[PDB]
Design a protein that fits this description.
The structure holds two protein chains of two kinds.
Chain A (H helix, E strand, L loop, with lengths): L3 E10 L3 H15 L1 E2 L2 E3 L5 E3 L4 E5 L6 E5 L2 H20 L5 E11 L10 E14 L4 H28 L24 E2 L2 E7 L2
Chain B lengths: L1 H19 L28 H11 L9 E10 L4 E11 L10 H18 L4 H7 L5 E10 L11 E10 L2 E9 L6
Antiparallel strand pairs in B: 1-2, 1-3, 2-5, 4-5
Helix pairs in contact in B: 1-2, 1-3
Classes of the chains: A alpha+beta, B alpha+beta.
Family (chain B): Belongs to the ATG13 family. Metazoan subfamily.
Protein name (chain B): Autophagy-related protein 13
Subcellular location (chain B): Cytoplasm, Cytosol; Preautophagosomal structure
Amino acid sequence: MNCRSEVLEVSVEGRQVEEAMLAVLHTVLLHRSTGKFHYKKEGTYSIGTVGTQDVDCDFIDFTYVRVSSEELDRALRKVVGEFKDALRNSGGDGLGQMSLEFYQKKKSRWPFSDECIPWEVWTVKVHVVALATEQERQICREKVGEKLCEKIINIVEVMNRHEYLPKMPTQSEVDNVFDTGLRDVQPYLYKISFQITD
Amino acid sequence: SDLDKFIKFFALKTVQVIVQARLGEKICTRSSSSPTGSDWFNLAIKDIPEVTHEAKKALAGQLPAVGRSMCVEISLKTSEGDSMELEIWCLEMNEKCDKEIKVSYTVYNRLSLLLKSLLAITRVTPAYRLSRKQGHEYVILYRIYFGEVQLSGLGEGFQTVRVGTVGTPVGTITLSCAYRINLAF
């Protein structure tokens, strides 16, 4: 049950912040979602099909795979955009982070005080750097791409090391484990937040 | 055995994901709240008929075991005819190296997660961008074989990435990629 946390760090130009965050967040959500559950009265369930989609980055030499959910992608794009704005406007050293937390709603049989109990946290730290020339910008597109390849490999490797997943829920408790509010896909319950540290 | 069935289709879908990641075209499939007919592991992965044929042909009714691994070789062939191995994807299995396991959906879901990891990783090895840029001075080819793993041909310093592992009552499944990092003639 013990909550697991992972931290990733990337250095990027301002114009790459959104794509870098989306690449990481969607890779994690690809692993932390399933098809929509449809229960029968006896407690049996069928599971829908999750589609996936290649996404080319325009500001990074990189491609990531995401779940084919317009709703999920809209939600992530909104908060990532707000994070990028906050980072640009903060007037600091260009340092911030986003956290993606998977949690369960406490069951009555559980001895916890909080109503939301996390079981996985993913934190992506960013440092924004400014470049002087188109030359450097082109190089940065290539190099950030190579770093994101390393980050995705790291995500997959740590995924395999995380043994815990929530118990598959009965019909009465599905909303304690999964976000059932989307049409296409069924993510584990999650919250996204960000901080601006300097 | 429902399990032998799971492992067979996991192998077949593994080949589909790798070959489709090397076509030179972005892949896009749709979700469905309703269970789609003959999609496996709750993932929309369309089957290229020719690939299913080569995969079944190589497997020949066998499943991975010690000394018997399913390998997918990705290579580059220049317009002059010279060939170069880029990647070897290896689907391996351990022997009476199992786990006293749970209900069926559990192992099924773990295989599902491994395919999701494969989807991600196939986009971040060097051959991905090479495959997207193929078609003129070179093309990307694939070959499937079943037997002993041979990692020659990948050049000096080739890297290895572990996509993941799945424990089952009959052994541990492992999926990995060995890939060339220096293009050389």
